[PDB]
Amino acid sequence: IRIFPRIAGRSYIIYGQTSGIICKRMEKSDNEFVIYNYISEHYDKFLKKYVPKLYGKNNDMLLLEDLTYNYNNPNVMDVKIGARKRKSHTSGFFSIRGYTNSHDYKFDPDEYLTSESTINHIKNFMEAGGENRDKTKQVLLKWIMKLSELANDLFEINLKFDGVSLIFIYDDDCSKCDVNVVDFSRVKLIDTNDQMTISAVTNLIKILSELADNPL
């Protein structure tokens, strides 16, 4: 069994026996599966735009689209935009849980950060994208484009996105990038929209916009 190079979480995640699939164990309940099916039926468009494809269930394993598959040299960042179980966010509106090569920059998932340190970590994650300034900006701008639509669409969705993350990805050559929403294990039905989760996305859009705009 080939272990999947996670960037965060404690979940058992392996490569599928097949190309472009990862197998994630549902450790505690089947809630993740219940939530994908509910979103599939009530917010189909949201699932297609923002969420890795669920190809199937196998006992307690979900077969999920590998978001890294189409990438020569993927850089991954996990940012928790949903509410934490009991702790407050390490960056106010959201918590960076890890990124490719975070070890090299002495990143610590338990450390509460200033705005300066939050921004510095996101710049650290962007460093593997090289010094072509007008190409790493294109990556930031494609992220802003999809996070913008996601925030907009979140106003119309009556779920509490407890625990969910954004997986940011970009290839070393900056030819390709994306961001998707993952990990529905703790998501709940509610009667309003999730303003906490919306503020996380808007705060990220703000930070990425300041990076896409500064001239340094």
Ligand X SMILES: O=P(O)(O)O[C@H]1[C@H](OP(=O)(O)O)[C@@H](OP(=O)(O)O)[C@H](OP(=O)(O)O)[C@@H](OP(=O)(O)O)[C@@H]1OP(=O)(O)O
Taking the complex as a whole, how short is the minimal distance between the CB of residue 27 and ligand ADP, in angstroms? 8
94: tokens are: 């959201």
Residues lying near ligand X in the complex (CB under 6 A) are found at: 9-11, 27, 84-87, 163, 185-186
Residue number closest to ligand ADP, CB atom: 9
Taking the complex as a whole, how short is the minimal distance between the CB of residue 82 and Mg ion, in angstroms? 9
Q: Of these partners, ligand ADP, Mg ion, ligand X, none, which one is at the site of residue 7 (CB under 5 to 8 Å by kind)?
A: ligand ADP
The alpha carbon of residue 78 and the mean position of all alpha carbons in its chain are separated, in whole angstroms, by: 5
Cα→Cα distances 187→23, 54, 209, Å:
20, 16, 28
Taking the complex as a whole, how short is the minimal distance between the CB of residue 78 and ligand X, in angstroms? 10
Q: Is 49 annotated as a binding residue?
A: no
Q: Is 133 annotated as a binding residue?
A: no
Torsion, CA 162, CA 126, CA 8, CA 184, rounded to 10: 30
Q: Is 128 annotated as a binding residue?
A: no
Q: Is 91 annotated as a binding residue?
A: no
Distance CA(71)–CA(74), nearest Å, equals: 5
Judged by CB, which is closer to Mg ion: 11, or 40? 11
Q: Is 183 annotated as a binding residue?
A: yes
Cα→Cα distances 172→7, 10, 53, 63, 136, Å:
17, 26, 24, 27, 10
Judged by CB, which is closer to ligand ADP: 135, or 188? 188
Q: Of these partners, ligand X, Mg ion, ligand ADP, none, which one is at the site of residue 84 (CB under 5 to 8 Å by kind)?
A: ligand X
Q: Is 186 annotated as a binding residue?
A: yes
Footprint on residues 6-65 left by ligand ADP (CB under 6 A): 6-11, 13, 22, 52, 64-65
Footprint on residues 151-210 left by ligand ADP (CB under 6 A): 165, 167, 182-183, 185
Distance CA(196)–CA(158), nearest Å, equals: 13
Tell which phi-psi region holds residue 22, choosing left (phi > 0), alpha (psi between -120 and 50) or beta: beta
Annotated binding site for Mg(2+): 183
Annotated binding site: 7-8, 10-11, 24, 28, 65-67, 78, 80, 84-87, 183, 186
Please give the residue ranges that form the binding site for ligand ADP (CB under 6 A): 6-11, 13, 22, 52, 64-68, 76, 78, 165, 167, 182-183, 185
